[PDB]
Amino acid sequence: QISTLNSSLSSLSQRITSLQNTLASLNSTISSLSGTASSLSSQLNALQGKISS
Amino acid sequence: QISTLNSSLSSLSQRITSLQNTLASLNSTISSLSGTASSLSSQLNALQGKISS
């Protein structure tokens, strides 16, 4: 049974660790997206000023 | 006490399968977000072309 526990913990940990890795890439992707929207917003408002003129 | 550790590992194993599922859903959501960013760029560049005529 001690062996059985070690084997279960290694699988459980390896799952957590891949999930850490994956989350960090998705965190990055959220900073990038917000950034896309933020550039698109500036460009919208500039265009809005152009149509007004 | 090991029995009690098994009981914690069973719970942890259900929770981590569920955590995977929630992270997988969210990654579809991130993909979705990237699509909505792309559509909005498409609509703007069309809107600028019209702006030049």
Asked if B47 and A50 come within 8 Å (Cβ–Cβ), the reply is no
Q: What resolution in Å is listed for this PDB structure?
A: 11.2
- Which of B11-16's residues contact partners 24+ apart within 8 Å by CB, and which partners? B12/A12, B13/A8, B13/A12, B16/A12, B16/A15, B16/A16, B16/A19
Of B12, B23, B44, the CB nearest to A19: B23
Burial (CB count within 10 angstroms: exposed 0-12, middle 13-18, buried 19+), residue A19: middle
Q: How many CA atoms lie within 13 A of A5 on its CB side?
A: 10
The answer to whether A7 contacts chain B (CB < 8 Å) is: no
